[PDB]
Amino acid sequence: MRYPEHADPVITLTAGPVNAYPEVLRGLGRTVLYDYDPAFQLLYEKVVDKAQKAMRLSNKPVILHGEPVLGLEAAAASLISPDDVVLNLASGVYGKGFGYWAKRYSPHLLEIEVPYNEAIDPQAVADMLKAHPEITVVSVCHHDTPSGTINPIDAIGALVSAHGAYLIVDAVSSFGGMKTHPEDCKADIYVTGPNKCLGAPPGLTMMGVSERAWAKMKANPLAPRASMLSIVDWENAWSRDKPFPFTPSVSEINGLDVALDLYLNEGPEAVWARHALTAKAMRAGVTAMGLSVWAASDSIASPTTTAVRTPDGVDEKALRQAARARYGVVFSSGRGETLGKLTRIGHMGPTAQPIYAIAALTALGGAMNAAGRKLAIGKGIEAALAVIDADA
Amino acid sequence: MRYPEHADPVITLTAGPVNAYPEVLRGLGRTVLYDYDPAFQLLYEKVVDKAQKAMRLSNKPVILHGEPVLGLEAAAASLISPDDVVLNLASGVYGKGFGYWAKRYSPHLLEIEVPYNEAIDPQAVADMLKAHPEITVVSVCHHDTPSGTINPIDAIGALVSAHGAYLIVDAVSSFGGMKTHPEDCKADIYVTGPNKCLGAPPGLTMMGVSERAWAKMKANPLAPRASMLSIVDWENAWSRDKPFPFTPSVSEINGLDVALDLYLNEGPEAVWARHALTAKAMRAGVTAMGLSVWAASDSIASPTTTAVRTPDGVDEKALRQAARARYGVVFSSGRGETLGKLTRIGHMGPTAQPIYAIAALTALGGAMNAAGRKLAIGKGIEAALAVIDADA
Amino acid sequence: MRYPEHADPVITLTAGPVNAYPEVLRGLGRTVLYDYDPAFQLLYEKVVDKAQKAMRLSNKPVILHGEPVLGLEAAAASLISPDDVVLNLASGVYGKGFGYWAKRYSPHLLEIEVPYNEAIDPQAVADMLKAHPEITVVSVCHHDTPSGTINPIDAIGALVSAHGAYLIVDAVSSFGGMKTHPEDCKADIYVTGPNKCLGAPPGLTMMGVSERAWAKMKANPLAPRASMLSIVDWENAWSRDKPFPFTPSVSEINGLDVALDLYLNEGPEAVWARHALTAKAMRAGVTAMGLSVWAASDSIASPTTTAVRTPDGVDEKALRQAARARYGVVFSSGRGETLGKLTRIGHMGPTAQPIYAIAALTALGGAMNAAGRKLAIGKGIEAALAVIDADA
Amino acid sequence: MRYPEHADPVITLTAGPVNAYPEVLRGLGRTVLYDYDPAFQLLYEKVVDKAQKAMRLSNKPVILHGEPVLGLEAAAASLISPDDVVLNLASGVYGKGFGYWAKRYSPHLLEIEVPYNEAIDPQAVADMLKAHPEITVVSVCHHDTPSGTINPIDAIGALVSAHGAYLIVDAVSSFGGMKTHPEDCKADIYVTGPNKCLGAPPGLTMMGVSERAWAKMKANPLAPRASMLSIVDWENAWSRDKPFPFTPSVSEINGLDVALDLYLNEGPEAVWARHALTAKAMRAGVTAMGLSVWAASDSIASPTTTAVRTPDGVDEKALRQAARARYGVVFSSGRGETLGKLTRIGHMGPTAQPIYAIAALTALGGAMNAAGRKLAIGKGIEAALAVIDADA
Ligand SMILES: [Cl-]
Ligand SMILES: [Cl-]
Ligand SMILES: [Cl-]
Ligand SMILES: [Cl-]
């Protein structure tokens, strides 16, 4: 049998976008209220309050009404001005990518770059900051998804704070699926969104903003105002007694309301544990069957995405196509410089359940063996299952 | 009895946002596919095709992934260069508002402004173009929603074309509810969205772009690129064989797919007829009960929104609060200059049905009379019913 | 304009079936669990518990997995045996109809019948019971929907209890929309369902059963067992630790779960008040415009359905067809002996909001005037609105 | 980690009820129309038409408004008269169970019974019919689900027809998942439903009735009439111009409409192929890991359910509890005689995808090994994968 390309697949195991929880999809179907209806104004405020609790924030997070590249570009546009000297940390596609926006807003850019299977070394950061007291803004990506690797953002953020610089963090593919919060890493801007670990639909940005960052952006004549790129316009929009700069994405807010309830009701630590367990089982299976996890070390592998290195000689695009056509299972490609180098399996929200690692392993192994590899698929399943069974 | 502010209303008859069609709300609940899943790639392409058909476009419209203020800003940012001379037409809040974006991108701004219950005279546009042959871009709003009035964009567009200038049209609150299409007004950029007359939730922009406008933007090195404000980056994104600049709003695209199906299936002409008949009945009722339609003349009143002038000594905010608390019926406030001066009843998508005009008239009359007016509410209902019956 | 028969209508104001609440329709879309999954077993038990609370029952109500004619036939089949002498009370289609099932299960049938716009007189019942000590079972309909009239079931039930007979009550179209509960009327069998006042989808029966009724049915060799008509088979099925005689209607149970939450959260007295207010406004409008409420007296008119007498000469079928074709509003026909005599407007669940009485009045009046009547429609709306505005 | 009993599972792989298709679940959420709304009358007619097409029927199938035990009981009540001589075929719980209903309606009952992992031999049916030419009705179950075994109903039906007798077929758990149709087995009553292979929720019966069976039932004065057990009352109900005996399950009909669309759109042959391939892979895996399929031979194993024999000393209930608590995967118990003796994995509608067999094998192996077995789980997965790959 073969799954047609036009027909829906059986299981989507991708690393962004990902399927939303069934309850969230139902929440999307709530009646669309007028945004100035008192019931919507109250809902919006309570959604911001739930995001605040979720992010363990001392102040309100900002919801912006586009998907997280909006938050990222808006942060650069608003926080970085030509007087700033930016240190950009790049260990992957998003880290490197942020430097391009930084350079659009200040000519002064320094970078620490490591190959796209590695993590940024906090000692390298401490040294760079000591050598360059002129540094005023530092940007970092927590989970650089196209590599499935994690940077030590809490240590980095502490170093950056001691230096006296502002920190911009991309936690789009980490928040909700592992222990991380704006104040854990001393973030001045902390960008996340609904459609990775939180299992909500795509199209919103959730942003932690420090009081210090508010003052810098509001002072900056070059910060976007009356613009889709404006963070400053949205400062007070959380309040039931305040207007919306432009019409919010009402249905997405309904979905996010449900997703926040699910997260908080299940308990963040329980949610993080099942992300990590699913990823750990996946990695054990990949290694046991004869494949390699992309990450330079197991310690930096993401608990929300496993990136599997393509064996030299295998056509990675054809591999993913075979996994869908033969088994109905959809994996993520790489992106930019990781495209063709690896395959990604998301473990995010509804797919952060260990049984999906079992499905992923079987489809990935079967596809690989159809490409002429001779993987020990059975051994891989048994190794993944041993991890699940060992979990205390 | 009284409807609590915290609880949902019974009927929302607002002018943006508005309730989506129940079929569309169910469409939002579809499983969220990977955007690079071939089934989603196909779907996205087919949605653009359905958009092209609905908009009667000779080329592909662009879908942008933000609500229509994104399209308006991006159009100004991409089409207006610093050597352009822009003529902005302002008959209300959105028209006037656009001139601020124009001025951002060219210091050369001319304007025709009329009172905010009037429409732009095509003869005034012709006189201005004769006086200023250096004009290269003209911008206009079709339905300036906070006023509930309509500009003669097809007449205006013919004169803009006669002068060899580019036309930017905001048809956000008119497209799908009346006969209007990019071709009809010779628009170079035509901006609309799905959450007014089309009955889908907020969050997307549908933009008609002329081949001439494509050439102008592509040649403009200041036109946004690698930006949420970029139109040019999305040029080829409609195609199943091409990437997305950033992640599309998958669930919104699912809703839009359904909305376009409903519009095309019902028949655009039949859709426009019921919008216009609902508005016509509403206006007849408003006048018969002793209230005044805001519009300076009936000929310029929108078939998609009726604005009713607030009588002297009536608190408009209290009036809307009373209509909801007493009857469970929600109306729109004005915006900017019209805030506090008028009340808006939307006739859009699901609410473009004459029976909703009857509900509206009753709730509006009831709230007015509770504020001390002495309206002939029964006469209002009979006049609106006569309008409906005369069309039967 | 005209609404095609094949296309969906705008507002459904019928008296059974009726639209379900939006939340309930969403609840219908929950994943279908295995019925022996512990989470479903628990859900089922908590649904029975919520029905118990709703019905103010001292013991568990029984949910049967077909629409309420199942409960009615099952009650006759199980409780009535040939030794019984049944007094059937008939003031309408369902009351009379029950006598046919009674006669199937005992040859001994006595009846009190009144014309189908009247209510049963408790004095007539007291007299009949005194004259016939042999009576052992009495059946009564609370709201005989096809007439829109209410019987005094609490007084009747007390008389029946004093006699020492069993009482069977049909409260299908009354429970949830007015003050009524099994123990208010000393019911031995009290049959209701989800899809009238409770705003849940059709296909289940909720049944209050007295301990005395349990003992009579379980003793009866002729009571259905291993049958769709079996009540006795389902006695213990409420418990998470017990099996289901046959597979329950899982999705309907999901919907009922949500409907019970809505009812209990809003508060039963508040729900009943808005049913009554909507009906009261409707009746005021009908009378003021020049039509007649079917009920012999206002005191017996249902707060959950208004039946409007067809003017002699008017084609009632054509009237309903015109109301839908012209205004998109759907009314109920009569049934059996009330078919052609009256039109029904349901005020049930989501349609028990006074603004819908306003819509109903306008469509009914407009349709009537298209049939050549000369109703004072405006006067009717003003009378309905006065009732709403007077409500303290 | 452990999945709480109170919380939802991750994957349900049961044999009835089963999860519905997500499109069907959204279909259940359609607005509930009045059943006499012309749009619903049309829809109901078209659903019966789609049912006729799917069932390859020369006449209209009857939809009854109760889950399929209603169809089975009603078929016995209507087709079997007291002078009929019934031959009941029993190879499991449902087959044996039907004889109890037959005996209710005729005292003349003959039976062929085989062990509950075997199938009925068509030659034994031929021998019995020769021995008892007075036989007038024969009843048989196609897939006796609690055993996961299949009877040769087409062979049996040809011999029943050769003897001039009527055939009643239970195809509740086979229709839509394998090649089977009323015509194929010369059935006079053919009972199925939508909540197995068709992936709609429980609550309806779809019944094929031969013209000969119609004549027999209509002439039977004991066939239920004015009863939820009545088939004859529903004879003309399919028609948009005819009434419904009682209120149809509107929302279920909405779901069925969608389910039939999915089945016809995908292609019945393609649907049957993936059921059979999923079951075949499951059986290969079960055997390879060291477990036994219940069925006496592979040739009689159902392509829609695999039953796995419980090893000596394994608590089957604890096993299912372990599979859910450890892996979030839900299996079916046996029923009656097979309860405690086997575990069932359904391959039905949405779960008839080979990747689910992989999830099933892993959860089943894992739970077995936690109960002290020493299964070759990896060998199991590879055998199931080889089956999938051989069909590719
Ligand atoms: Cl996101
Ligand atoms: Cl919009
Ligand atoms: Cl009901
Ligand atoms: Cl079924």
Coordinates of all heavy atoms in Angstrom, one line a residue, chain D residues 342-382:
Chain D
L342 N -8.6 -13.8 26.1 CA -7.9 -13.2 24.9 C -8.0 -11.6 25.0 O -8.8 -11.1 25.8 CB -8.6 -13.6 23.6 CG -10.1 -13.3 23.4 CD1 -10.4 -11.9 22.9 CD2 -10.6 -14.3 22.3
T343 N -7.1 -11.0 24.3 CA -7.1 -9.5 24.2 C -7.4 -9.2 22.7 O -6.9 -9.9 21.8 CB -5.7 -8.9 24.6 OG1 -5.4 -9.3 25.9 CG2 -5.8 -7.4 24.5
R344 N -8.2 -8.1 22.5 CA -8.5 -7.7 21.1 C -7.9 -6.4 20.7 O -7.9 -5.4 21.5 CB -10.0 -7.7 20.8 CG -10.7 -9.0 20.9 CD -12.2 -8.9 20.6 NE -12.9 -8.3 21.8 CZ -14.2 -7.8 21.7 NH1 -14.9 -7.8 20.6 NH2 -14.8 -7.3 22.8
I345 N -7.3 -6.4 19.6 CA -6.8 -5.1 18.9 C -7.7 -4.9 17.7 O -7.6 -5.6 16.8 CB -5.3 -5.2 18.6 CG1 -4.4 -5.7 19.8 CG2 -4.8 -3.9 18.0 CD1 -4.3 -7.2 19.9
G346 N -8.4 -3.8 17.7 CA -9.2 -3.4 16.6 C -8.3 -2.8 15.5 O -7.4 -2.0 15.8
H347 N -8.7 -3.1 14.3 CA -8.1 -2.4 13.1 C -9.3 -1.9 12.3 O -9.9 -2.6 11.5 CB -7.3 -3.4 12.3 CG -6.4 -4.3 13.1 ND1 -5.4 -3.9 13.9 CD2 -6.5 -5.7 13.2 CE1 -4.8 -4.9 14.5 NE2 -5.5 -6.0 14.1
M348 N -9.8 -0.7 12.6 CA -11.1 -0.3 12.2 C -11.2 1.2 11.9 O -10.8 2.0 12.8 CB -12.2 -0.6 13.3 CG -12.7 -2.0 13.3 SD -13.6 -2.4 14.8 CE -14.2 -4.0 14.4
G349 N -11.6 1.6 10.7 CA -11.7 3.0 10.3 C -10.3 3.6 10.5 O -9.3 3.2 9.9
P350 N -10.3 4.7 11.3 CA -9.0 5.4 11.5 C -7.8 4.6 12.0 O -6.7 5.0 11.8 CB -9.4 6.5 12.6 CG -10.8 6.3 12.9 CD -11.4 5.2 12.1
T351 N -8.1 3.5 12.7 CA -7.0 2.6 13.2 C -6.7 1.5 12.3 O -5.8 0.7 12.6 CB -7.3 2.0 14.7 OG1 -8.4 1.1 14.6 CG2 -7.7 3.2 15.6
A352 N -7.3 1.5 11.1 CA -6.9 0.5 10.0 C -5.8 1.1 9.2 O -5.9 1.4 8.0 CB -8.1 0.2 9.2
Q353 N -4.6 1.3 9.9 CA -3.4 1.9 9.3 C -2.3 1.1 9.9 O -2.2 0.9 11.1 CB -3.2 3.3 9.6 CG -4.4 4.3 9.2 CD -4.6 4.6 7.7 OE1 -5.5 5.4 7.3 NE2 -3.9 3.9 6.8
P354 N -1.4 0.5 9.0 CA -0.4 -0.5 9.5 C 0.5 0.1 10.7 O 0.9 -0.7 11.5 CB 0.5 -0.8 8.3 CG -0.6 -0.8 7.2 CD -1.4 0.5 7.5
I355 N 0.8 1.4 10.7 CA 1.6 1.9 11.8 C 0.9 1.7 13.1 O 1.6 1.6 14.2 CB 1.9 3.4 11.5 CG1 3.1 3.9 12.4 CG2 0.7 4.3 11.6 CD1 4.5 3.2 12.1
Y356 N -0.4 1.6 13.2 CA -1.1 1.3 14.5 C -0.8 -0.1 14.9 O -0.8 -0.4 16.1 CB -2.6 1.7 14.4 CG -2.8 3.1 14.5 CD1 -3.5 3.8 13.5 CD2 -2.2 3.9 15.5 CE1 -3.7 5.2 13.5 CE2 -2.4 5.3 15.5 CZ -3.1 5.9 14.5 OH -3.3 7.3 14.6
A357 N -0.6 -1.0 14.0 CA -0.3 -2.4 14.4 C 1.1 -2.4 15.1 O 1.3 -3.1 16.1 CB -0.2 -3.3 13.2
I358 N 2.0 -1.5 14.6 CA 3.3 -1.4 15.3 C 3.2 -0.9 16.7 O 3.8 -1.4 17.7 CB 4.3 -0.4 14.5 CG1 4.4 -1.0 13.0 CG2 5.6 -0.3 15.2 CD1 5.0 -2.4 13.0
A359 N 2.4 0.2 16.9 CA 2.1 0.7 18.3 C 1.5 -0.4 19.2 O 2.0 -0.6 20.3 CB 1.2 2.0 18.2
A360 N 0.5 -1.1 18.6 CA -0.2 -2.2 19.3 C 0.8 -3.3 19.8 O 0.8 -3.7 20.9 CB -1.3 -2.8 18.4
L361 N 1.6 -3.7 18.8 CA 2.6 -4.8 19.1 C 3.5 -4.4 20.3 O 3.8 -5.2 21.1 CB 3.3 -5.2 17.9 CG 2.5 -5.9 16.8 CD1 3.3 -5.9 15.5 CD2 2.2 -7.4 17.2
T362 N 4.0 -3.2 20.2 CA 4.9 -2.7 21.2 C 4.3 -2.6 22.6 O 4.8 -3.1 23.6 CB 5.5 -1.3 20.8 OG1 6.0 -1.5 19.5 CG2 6.7 -0.9 21.8
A363 N 3.1 -2.0 22.7 CA 2.3 -1.9 24.0 C 1.9 -3.3 24.5 O 2.1 -3.5 25.7 CB 1.0 -1.0 23.8
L364 N 1.5 -4.2 23.7 CA 1.1 -5.5 24.0 C 2.3 -6.4 24.5 O 2.2 -7.0 25.6 CB 0.4 -6.3 22.8 CG 0.0 -7.7 23.0 CD1 -1.2 -7.8 24.0 CD2 -0.4 -8.3 21.7
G365 N 3.4 -6.4 23.7 CA 4.7 -7.0 24.1 C 5.2 -6.4 25.4 O 5.6 -7.2 26.3
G366 N 5.2 -5.1 25.6 CA 5.7 -4.4 26.8 C 4.9 -4.8 28.0 O 5.5 -5.1 29.1
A367 N 3.6 -4.9 27.9 CA 2.7 -5.3 29.0 C 2.9 -6.8 29.4 O 2.9 -7.1 30.5 CB 1.2 -4.9 28.7
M368 N 3.0 -7.6 28.3 CA 3.2 -9.0 28.5 C 4.5 -9.3 29.3 O 4.6 -10.1 30.2 CB 3.3 -9.8 27.2 CG 2.0 -10.1 26.5 SD 1.0 -11.3 27.4 CE -0.4 -11.4 26.3
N369 N 5.6 -8.5 28.9 CA 6.9 -8.7 29.5 C 6.9 -8.2 30.9 O 7.6 -8.7 31.8 CB 8.0 -8.1 28.6 CG 8.4 -9.1 27.5 OD1 9.3 -8.8 26.7 ND2 7.7 -10.2 27.3
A370 N 6.1 -7.2 31.2 CA 5.9 -6.7 32.6 C 5.1 -7.7 33.4 O 5.3 -7.6 34.7 CB 5.2 -5.3 32.5
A371 N 4.4 -8.5 32.8 CA 3.7 -9.6 33.5 C 4.5 -10.9 33.6 O 4.1 -12.0 34.1 CB 2.3 -9.9 32.8
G372 N 5.8 -10.8 33.2 CA 6.8 -11.9 33.4 C 7.0 -12.8 32.2 O 7.7 -13.7 32.3
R373 N 6.4 -12.4 31.0 CA 6.7 -13.2 29.8 C 8.0 -12.7 29.2 O 8.6 -11.7 29.7 CB 5.6 -13.0 28.8 CG 4.3 -13.6 29.2 CD 4.3 -15.2 29.0 NE 3.8 -15.9 30.1 CZ 3.5 -17.2 30.1 NH1 3.7 -17.9 29.1 NH2 2.9 -17.7 31.2
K374 N 8.6 -13.5 28.3 CA 9.9 -13.1 27.7 C 9.7 -13.2 26.2 O 10.3 -14.1 25.5 CB 11.0 -14.1 28.2 CG 11.4 -13.9 29.6 CD 12.3 -15.1 30.1 CE 13.2 -14.7 31.3 NZ 12.3 -14.2 32.5
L375 N 9.0 -12.2 25.7 CA 8.7 -12.1 24.3 C 9.8 -11.5 23.5 O 10.5 -10.6 24.0 CB 7.4 -11.3 24.1 CG 6.0 -12.0 24.0 CD1 5.9 -13.4 24.6 CD2 5.0 -11.1 24.6
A376 N 9.9 -11.9 22.2 CA 10.9 -11.2 21.3 C 10.2 -10.0 20.6 O 9.7 -10.1 19.5 CB 11.4 -12.2 20.2
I377 N 10.2 -8.9 21.3 CA 9.3 -7.8 20.8 C 9.9 -7.2 19.5 O 9.1 -6.9 18.6 CB 9.2 -6.7 21.9 CG1 8.4 -7.2 23.1 CG2 8.5 -5.4 21.3 CD1 8.5 -6.4 24.4
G378 N 11.2 -7.0 19.5 CA 11.9 -6.6 18.3 C 11.7 -7.5 17.1 O 11.4 -7.0 16.0
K379 N 11.7 -8.8 17.3 CA 11.4 -9.7 16.2 C 9.9 -9.6 15.8 O 9.6 -9.6 14.6 CB 11.6 -11.2 16.7 CG 13.1 -11.5 17.0 CD 13.5 -12.9 16.6 CE 12.4 -13.9 16.8 NZ 11.5 -14.2 15.6
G380 N 9.0 -9.3 16.7 CA 7.6 -9.0 16.4 C 7.5 -7.8 15.5 O 6.8 -7.8 14.5
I381 N 8.2 -6.7 15.9 CA 8.1 -5.5 15.1 C 8.7 -5.7 13.7 O 8.1 -5.3 12.7 CB 8.8 -4.3 15.8 CG1 8.1 -3.9 17.1 CG2 8.9 -3.0 14.8 CD1 6.6 -3.7 17.0
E382 N 9.8 -6.4 13.6 CA 10.4 -6.7 12.2 C 9.5 -7.6 11.4 O 9.4 -7.3 10.1 CB 11.8 -7.2 12.4 CG 12.7 -6.3 13.1 CD 14.2 -6.8 13.2 OE1 14.3 -8.1 13.2 OE2 15.1 -6.0 13.4

